[PDB]
Design a binder for this molecule. Sequence first.
Ligand SMILES: [Mg+2]
Ligand SMILES: [Mg+2]
Ligand SMILES: [Mg+2]
Ligand SMILES: [Mg+2]
Ligand SMILES: [Mg+2]
Ligand SMILES: [Mg+2]
Ligand SMILES: [Mg+2]
Ligand SMILES: [Mg+2]
Lengths: 207, 84, 150, 129, 190, 83
Amino acid sequence: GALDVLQMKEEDVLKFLAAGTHLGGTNLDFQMEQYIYKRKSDGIYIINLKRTWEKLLLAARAIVAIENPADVSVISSRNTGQRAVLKFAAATGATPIAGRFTPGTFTNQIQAAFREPRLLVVTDPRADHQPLTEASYVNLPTIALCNTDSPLRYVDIAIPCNNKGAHSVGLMWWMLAREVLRMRGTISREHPWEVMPDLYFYRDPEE
Amino acid sequence: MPLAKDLLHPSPEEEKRKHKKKRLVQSPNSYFMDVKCPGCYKITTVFSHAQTVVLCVGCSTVLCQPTGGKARLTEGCSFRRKQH
Amino acid sequence: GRMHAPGKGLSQSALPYRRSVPTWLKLTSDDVKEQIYKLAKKGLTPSQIGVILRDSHGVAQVRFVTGNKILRILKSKGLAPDLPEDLYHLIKKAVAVRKHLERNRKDKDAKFRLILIESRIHRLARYYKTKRVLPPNWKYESSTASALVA
Amino acid sequence: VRMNVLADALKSINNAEKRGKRQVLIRPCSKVIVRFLTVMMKHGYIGEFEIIDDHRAGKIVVNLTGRLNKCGVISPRFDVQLKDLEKWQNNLLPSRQFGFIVLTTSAGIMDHEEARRKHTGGKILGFFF
Amino acid sequence: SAKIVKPNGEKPDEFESGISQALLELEMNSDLKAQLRELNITAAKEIEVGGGRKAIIIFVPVPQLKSFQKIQVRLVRELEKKFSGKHVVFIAQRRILPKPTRKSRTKNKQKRPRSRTLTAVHDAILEDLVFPSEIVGKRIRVKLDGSRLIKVHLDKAQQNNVEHKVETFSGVYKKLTGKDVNFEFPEFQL
Amino acid sequence: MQNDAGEFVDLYVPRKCSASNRIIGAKDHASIQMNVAEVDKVTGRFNGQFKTYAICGAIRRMGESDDSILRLAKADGIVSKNF
RNA sequence: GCUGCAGUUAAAAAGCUCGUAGUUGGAUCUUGUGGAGGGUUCCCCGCCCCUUGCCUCUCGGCGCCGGCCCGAAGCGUUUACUUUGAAAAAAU
Ligand SMILES: [Mg+2]
Ligand SMILES: [Mg+2]
Ligand SMILES: [Mg+2]
Ligand SMILES: [Mg+2]
Ligand SMILES: [Mg+2]
Ligand SMILES: [Mg+2]
Ligand SMILES: [Mg+2]
Ligand SMILES: [Mg+2]
């Protein structure tokens, strides 16, 4: 937003640079060109943070406008985003899908997995292409976290970030939960949040 | 292809990336420069893409060499781009 | 789109929009004209005069300093050659090719390129005769053409 | 070569409308292009336009609405004489309620609806609908 | 001198001769003579401005023009502090001729050279109106009611000399020709 | 669409896309009606009124609805400037 | 197949290039308002230079208080184009 209550604070830029979310890929595509600051001395692109923040608050403003919280289905297929989507759906009452997608869940009126969402959030356009291709049949908008080499086909609100590393992905889902819960009422601003981002990170099997 | 690009007010740097003619209004990439021989002393004015051999007067009896592009000065010190 | 070649490139020059003289200038209109006459006396074609003036002196385009183009300047004093150098250089090249052709007759690529050069010569003489620059009884014949160059 | 300047000005406008572009650049500019654009803009098929002036023929930048459906040229400039006009606007135009034929008459470059209002034939240039 | 220095200008003129005699006066003094040699003029006029000011035009005979331009700074400041509260602009007085085909019936006179065309003189006027600024770009926006709007783009050097005068350029032009002009200093020098 | 008497003789008036001004047909199962929320300008909380945007299937298929919504929002104070 | 067809694989682009006729050919050379017909700028009379328009006189009918003046003579370099008049048997 244009305001000052919605502006990025110094405590969040440290969370960003600590998770590494500013660090892009090696290849750029001509649709993500407005989100890049400059290519490093070695071949890697820096993502502009102020632009990440504005696209993240636009996604939150798109999610808050849906009345029933339970038709904002969230999807992750890679192993890094499963815990994050499960915790995001818990914190704000969406319906998560981790693992395989079982094509036809959006367009098949027999299956027991058939639902009719009203939004669609997704971790990675290039790894969860089946939900996008199916959303392209039932008038279904889409929000997506994009790496610097993400194809922006059928996505409607791309959020630029490092999409590869587990810490980055969990931090982005945590911040998306923070800002929907903030502007819906609920956990009012001028307080830190009870949950720490590490509840949202990938497990990466332990000792 | 952002589908809403602005053609009338281009970038101050992306309009110097283009060809000399494909830009909005044509402009040459060449320039004129003051050159100093360190020997005799004048102010010879030389074209950047010379393609000729230049002498000062007598003295060094060379001041530039022609190439396939910008001419190179032998040891002509202090060369200044002239302006508009 | 090359006339007699299958290539196509844009290597032309591009003179600027500010058509005024450059605020600095070591010369003035009639000093340029004398500098032109001097080089014209030594046997330089207008193109050579313009390059020499561009490379060692401040004059980027004579026409912006003196009003007239170089050939009109050379004419208003009676110094232009009898035939323009566009045709002169082509006749010189055709004579050069025909000498080699007379030396070794097993060269067929030289035959082809000579045909193309002469096509250019004819297409240019046909236009120079329309503007009354050449007499209407002018004719490119190989022998008298070798005579013309000298 | 570029035998016809208006033809490629109109085809480059029309190739960009099919693509959703907000603006086009067309070059070279010409007297007849500016008049045809003014006729097409008076009705509301295009927005404002700007002329970029080099010291040569120049370039135009046009602001495209999404209202234009097709504009085009008639390749030889045929003579049209106020009785052929009905048989012309029954081939080129998509209906009788919209779409215009542009022709040059001795009173300027105008449309057919004004040509009959001023009792003048002329030469056909093109159409837009 | 001061009574014949408006030839083909109907020399007895209150305001024109008023500018004249004072101009020729501070010319005739021995202050600075190496700058001028009592050059002719032909006309002058004071014109109003939308901003509520006064601007006087100096119609120079065109073969003089280059020699006026060689100064153009001492003369303007002197005549300005003499007529303080106004603005001073110089124009070289050129001739428009009717279209040879049809704006006036032909009688087989001559070819009507290009310099005497309407557009050529209308451009040379704008060249002379803003001399120290050396026009570097032009643009024309045709708006949604049929009227046009010209934009001139001048250097970012010689700025502080013209933008205080830049308001009166619009008035001078809209009074001479009839077009709406704007003046800009572009995005950046490129 | 009216007639000379004045009434409106039409089944319905189809909506038009907000990025390309082309109407959205009746069998375009790729067009959306994205709806974004408005905040209360002081505490940054949702309050009723919201904005709505339609995007056609074609320009959504060429990967351009992303940088089109960004422009429809920035033009309209949801983002003000300086994206 | 002018409106209006075809020539990668169904029938079909000369092996390739030059070239006279033929067909085609880049940009550029005057604009607001007073009254007036259609709106509240814009599209017959005339003003920033011209706006049928310069003239050279002459005889014929026209002003006015021997004198004063505009219409009448050339015509706007020409064409194509376009609008309008004239002149084109009936029968069908
Ligand atoms: Mg080419
Ligand atoms: Mg070359
Ligand atoms: Mg060349
Ligand atoms: Mg067939
Ligand atoms: Mg076969
Ligand atoms: Mg076959
Ligand atoms: Mg072949
Ligand atoms: Mg032409």
